[model samples]
Target: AVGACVLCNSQTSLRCGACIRRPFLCCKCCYDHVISTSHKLVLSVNPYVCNAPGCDVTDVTQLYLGGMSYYCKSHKPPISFPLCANGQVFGLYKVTDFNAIATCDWTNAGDYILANTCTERLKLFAAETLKATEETFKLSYGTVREVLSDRELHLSWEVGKPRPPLNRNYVFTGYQIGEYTFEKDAVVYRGTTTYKLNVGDYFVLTSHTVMPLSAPTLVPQEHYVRITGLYPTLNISDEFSSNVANYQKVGMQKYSTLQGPPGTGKSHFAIGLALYYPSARIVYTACSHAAVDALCEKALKYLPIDKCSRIIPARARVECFDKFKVNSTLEQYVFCTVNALPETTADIVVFDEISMATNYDLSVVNARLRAKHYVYIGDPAQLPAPRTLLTKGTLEPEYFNSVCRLMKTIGPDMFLGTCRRCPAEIVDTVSALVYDNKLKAHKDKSAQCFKMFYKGVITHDVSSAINRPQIGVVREFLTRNPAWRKAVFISPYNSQNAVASKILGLPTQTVDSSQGSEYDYVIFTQTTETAHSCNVNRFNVAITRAKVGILCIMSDRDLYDKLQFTSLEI
Candidate 1:
């Protein structure tokens, strides 16, 4: 059928060149977007998969950093984007130049980014800050060009628009991939800059800086765990993370806490332990059903069907508990918000988002850990466990923070340092606040995580006639940028959060309740209308929740206004 098209207002199975005019097109508008037909174009064909093993759950939005990347494992649908623009592909590009589509890098030509075997002292130029603090650069065409690094754009020279700049030749931006010396006996990178550049070494440059990949090097766990058929993905890499090293040391202990910042993957660590100690009855519980459901998804997806079938259902909302024979019940493992949890002993109990559980709740849950081992996982820096009452110094522990205090005071080995989450930039922002300003920031970036996106502070009208207009902006942002990302609309104050859920219909949670949790996307209501709304710690915890992306909804009056107390600047 020939229907509304770009040029002749006709419709047909569109044929477009691999290169850009518009990504996809029809004969109505040539793939080149010009009247000519010199550009290569082809008709699309749909292929059927019949006799196929279940395909891998691979949702890769490869981040070329010099341009664009959308990391969505989510089923969220797409939207029509404005192409002839300043910079924005459905809110993904913060500094993309529309005119720049002239290089082989833009053609997805792999050979372009791969540097040929050569070493030259490329002349250095001015390092421009293309987009604010996040790495977005612009520079010359020569190898000597010094420009801002783009995580999404390709890592090459002059692929963008042939436009003006200092000594204007042309420049390209993209990701930096990791390449390391490897052998069964090769000396490892070991998360150091002693050999590689302070940033990293011979690599593919992209949105996030990846370290050299290597085979999983098993730490001697003394048979506490067997490596047999354990999913390769679960194994810690050859370069052991500091946290992994610490975890292995006291991993055998009965009661312990794995406390650290986000991206360290408390969930990932817990699941790995579950797989390792398969013989042990590992019961998992979390603050939210979304979390438990995720655990169920990963565990079932990674383990054998027999094991999945035998699994004590983690997310009850998805299935009936009575539908299967369970070794342990939810009450046996899960200590939901109250003291009613009867003591159901098991070999091991893993409490995720432990910082979200009240001290009393922990006490009640603790009284029930009738077996040998129970582990607590959380971020001490986040908000406290929600409770009906707060008596500062009494039998009642104030928040989960108190429980962590008591836990840590009792044992030092229970805590694990060294984060494995977020890119270096995010960790920098988070650790600066949570770690008493001691943990220095790492130089290398992460492909999985994105730079912090700041949409400056604005003053909301007092008459409380506010929150709706901007909330609309918030909704548009999330709706357009759909990936398998769960972004919660958070505010420190209940009233700013009180900005009406109907106004900003994001899966909403207050900063108080949002503690001990992490997200791929964190859309925070950063506008500090109520002068007293900003708590440095609350902001700290709120900002860190985002893994791949952090959107600060900063609302305020004066630029220098502390918003109350500003120990840490966003």
Candidate 2:
């Protein structure tokens, strides 16, 4: 009864301003009776208006969208929404055509009105009913053509006196020779908020920011080396091609580092080590869900089905377990993300993608688990770990990467110097350009091709726009090699991925996202010609993803010169 419409007995946040009694009305009731009753509508700005029967509520300073009806801050009701809610603020669209001429945005401070280029009038509409409002807003704040250089127009205007109702959808339309509408409507809501955490609770609240390690790490060693006895029973798949000396040197040390470039079998080595310590409890983790699942799959090959368990979050989708063929149960060895570390001690713990994790990420794992031995495995030359104020501290700038820090302080560096994933030509080029010619190629171990074709390190320098020509190159390549289906399109710019994915009918991923994964062929598409797009680390990761061949469609001559491209015909 407190906030129900007088006429319909439904939830209402609007009241009649003309009537002294202040009768409540929902949106529908107000629309139905507006002409008949001839009363002005007053929105109940909750937290600013008192719900008390005879309260004046003169201190109406802050207005918030309190759960449905208006009430004073002293009498605010409990919020009923979850911490994280999913909704979009504004619809996104490319301004290629002149169909849509203006944009409308609503904010707590005021509403935003911007013209697409220059328009006569902007009309507002109730997005739910598709009915236009009486007001025809004008953009007095001049246009800026330079901001959107692609001949797009923009005009800005703001009004706060006639405030629009909150939590309602609205669409804006502009007129030129013909009528045009915004991509879609937008709705206003209370912005995303976070629960206040205590000072100490913040330390371990996230995977990137973690608690400090105060306790000394004590790695328990096997009374006698037990790995030699289990060698006969091991699966020893072809993927297990890393040097036994490299693995054994790190396997015996309490704290060790295994540094390797892409396709050097880091995950495979971790699985084999777990198999060696038959009686030891092992906890394996990585920064991403894909990395965790990948290691879990590798574990299934060598370890018994019962001995390997993949620990995923409680909220993990059922499809994840089904698609990856992983089981979330407690076994002798557990694979999990840094956020979901299990509450148990272990003899050894392996951190994959070690360079992708910050010092705090490594510290938190050690603080939670009491492992006897720690194996940090990754290539520091690859993309550096993601860092933020929350993940980094003031001192030890170089040591932000826990892997590099550990390799220097905790143990000797064990390098896996081989390129088993790419062809001899690709290995030779990437090694010279990125790895300082340290990575060697095994002539017998290159990625097997369905058909013998050598199109390694081929580049196409386009003079026109890169997107269309790049797609044409891809289409032509696919047409020639119909069997080359295991391929990925990598782009430095994200805007190109949607376009390529739409036209090519295949997924396109950013180089950063494709760090741990590899394919038979890689289509390196560069949408922008800027030199900033040519990151050395990104080039190494993207190019090396190709096991058989790489096709680089580039516009920047500087990158072309730096890559030292050869005249290899496709």
Candidate 3:
């Protein structure tokens, strides 16, 4: 009987005599057949064979050829089966021939087949395991590693046990059939191999990550005008027109000076200007309380109820009454003295007799206000401050010097050129005296009613032998001469008793006591003192009180020295 080849058809067959087993063999034929059919075999080599349904080819030596027995010693079988159609044979069992396989079994399987079978699956599994391991590793170390292979796997005996619990995974195979002990140790893979991680690239952490940036916008500030739509005119004289124009051009700048002589309409002009500029406030300050009262009265007349409804005048508004006071309002016009002025910002301030006011008074007026315009009206050459002791001793001289210097500085504004109100004789006398000339009596002046005296005396002249008995002589002359009643008595001292005892035999009355009481005949005494002193102030006051005539009595030669006389001299 011919034996069949389990893997390939071969003529050399092997048979068991006492057993019902038959197997094919390849003496040179099986070798040649295996060589020829090697391309069609799925499994090759020692652990591979054919497992047909009816064939019993368990071992390589069980083969028959041409009805003759064959053994391994006589016929040399190939190191493995010739080729297997369906399954491969090894020892006494048949193993299914697969492309590759890997499991806990190590029967006919080689490491190459097991690794090749598990390559793709193991790579996928390893990739998944690496990803999971990397996730775990990133939690602790921020890094991970992986292993990949297509064949020759080194499995761990403990199976599926991940190594290095926190960071490492390795497999070791102690099952060695020969000298190769398949083992691998986990290591940090830092090669050039790139991995496209699914996580995005990093950036700075911030809350505005999803928000967009833009430019800032600007808003303008608002403005407003509180008061408007009221026009007020101001009237100033031609003399001060340029200054007033300049001040108005400067939008109501405060004035420093106003220049004019007596009766030059200083007060009248100021009042008119105030009325013209109804919106402008006016403050009038003078050296004396009487002057302030007089100005107030004038302002009241100019600002009647119909015109200045804003003003409130005192009841029973009569002229020359000391009790009368003018009413003022903040919303309209204001008229007040320096002391009684309201606390307000003035548009215009007028100062009458500014030169007569002391520096202290100036400082007070200046301190009382923030005025937009100021008008200083006075002739410092015509009058000095009312002479008290201190004023006479210290302030008058300094004030005179300052005023003279100020007049020079102000130049044309000094305004001393005209004298329209004086008689021709008086004007000529003033001109001569101002020009520093000696006494010169007019030839036709003796017949005139006015009398002028040069160095006369009331008592014995202590400096000279001339005993003129000025007091008794003037008294007897005045007692006999009724025209002398219109004459005035001018004295240096307010205590006129001694002179009056010698003259009228009664105590002399002071000018203050004699106010509103007229005197025609007059006599002046104690002319030895300089006119710049306080006595001169009293003398001027007494002399000016005489509306008719005057007789001056003196013996002091110093009175005659540097004294310039005029047409009044006889």
Candidate 4:
């Protein structure tokens, strides 16, 4: 029938009608229909088909069954089938249904058919036999008693009589991975000729080699305890608590500088804060060793004694422990000097005289290297840079006006109020003089009992008789006035031996003996002409020594003018 091309089974097989006008419709009828309707369909298949004589079968098996008549070398057959020769029977199978035909060899074709039929019967018979065997016998092992009582029967057996023992020793050889041996020799061994042996000996056995386990590690455990509270000191107070809290809250970046005059309780506050935060390390330092020692002494007195005793095994070894113990009870406080402090990680640092500190010393305060928080306390008004010049000719000023100016500009960072120890009268008088009003006095002014004298006349009345006998008159006055015992006398020149002898008087008779014993007076005679050159320091030392009063004696009005008495008068 000329109805359709048998290979492709397509009605329009004359030309590529599905693909000619529409290049996209080249794959299959569904794809062609999709393209015609303008609906896309992508197809994956070979477009060509084999056209040899017997190849025009609907199913692949029929074509292959006919063999060479349908062979088309140019068109490969579908990969699933094996090639067939003429006159050979091809096996047909459906992988999905398990239905299959077994082809036979020519010589055994009849016998093969008979054998297959018999094999099927035999298979059924064997299966029935296996089922019968399993059900009837119900194979099982011996009971525990039977197994135990039958122990004399050895599992290994030999068919023939035992042979004579071999005296030769067989050395073992093996390969190893790490420290483990993977192979070992298997040989029958005998202790004596009398030992029994078998010819075809065999054993149902397993060999096991155990690996030594590594010893467990012995690790050390760390012992630690959190320190909770701080030791109290006399100098520490509630102000320190507030400072610590504020420092923790607002932090170091906020208030970067701290300033206070001498005796304004800076060290006291520092010690108190340190005690409040005992676990937080604190560093205390100053411009000089003397200043550091002075701070250390104050800190010791303020520190809790029991705390100090715990840190120092021998209480006597602590330089100021005895003094501290007289008033405190708390213990276990740790205090170290600036020189002794390790540079890098203090939680709080107090620099007592930062203005006088050298560049090298100040470098220690830089945040990059040491403390995270710091307090700088000092009177910029009191001291100058140790070796800097202030003017071309005059002795450099002991104070830096620029520093004071800068401090005033940054006043909020500075703690500028007067100290409790600051002579209230002096503070009041100065405040009154500056603000143009009288100072209000305290109710118990005796508690603030320090005295001040107003030398109203800048010019002294120096009669020639008084000037000539000045040394003797001053000596008699000092001896007679017990109240001015610690008085310091300032003179114009160093050649005033008359004054020194009169004031120092006679040395005690014994060597290294303490003077001012029999009497209660201490008179300081400042006779050096260059005393004004160091007048700031001289005044500092002279004024601080007296618990009662200080007396000044001057001989030159020009020198007095040079002194610039403005800040000193009040």
lDDT tens digits, residues 172-210, model 3?
Answer: 111111111111133222111232322222211111111
> TM-score ranking from best to worst?
2, 1, 3, 4
Number of the top lDDT candidate: 2
Q: What is the C-alpha local distance difference test score of candidate 1? A: 0.40
Clashes of each: 43, 4, 24, 9
- Candidate 3 scores a C-alpha RMSD against the true structure in Å of 56.4
Best by TM-score: 2
Give the poorly placed runs of model 3, Cα more than 4 Å off. Answer: 1-253, 262-265, 275-279, 300-341, 386-405, 412-417, 420-422, 431-490, 497-526, 531-570
Segments in model 1 whose C-alpha atoms lie over 4 Å from true places:
1-252, 286-291, 304-342, 391-402, 407-423, 437-488, 493-509, 513-521, 527-532, 555-570
Give per-residue CA lDDT, model 1, range 89-162, as digits (tens): 11111201111222223222121111111111000000001111112222221221222332111122245644
lDDT of 2: 0.51
TM-score of each candidate structure, all chains considered together: 0.43, 0.54, 0.41, 0.39
Clashing pairs in 4: 233-302, 234-302, 236-272, 306-331, 306-332, 307-331, 307-332, 307-333, 485-522
lDDT of 2 by residue, 500-523 (tens): 666777767778778989887777
Better of 2 and 3 by lDDT: 2
Runs off by more than 4 Å, candidate 4: 1-255, 304-342, 365-369, 388-405, 422-473, 486-502, 505-546, 555-570
Global lDDT of model 3: 0.37
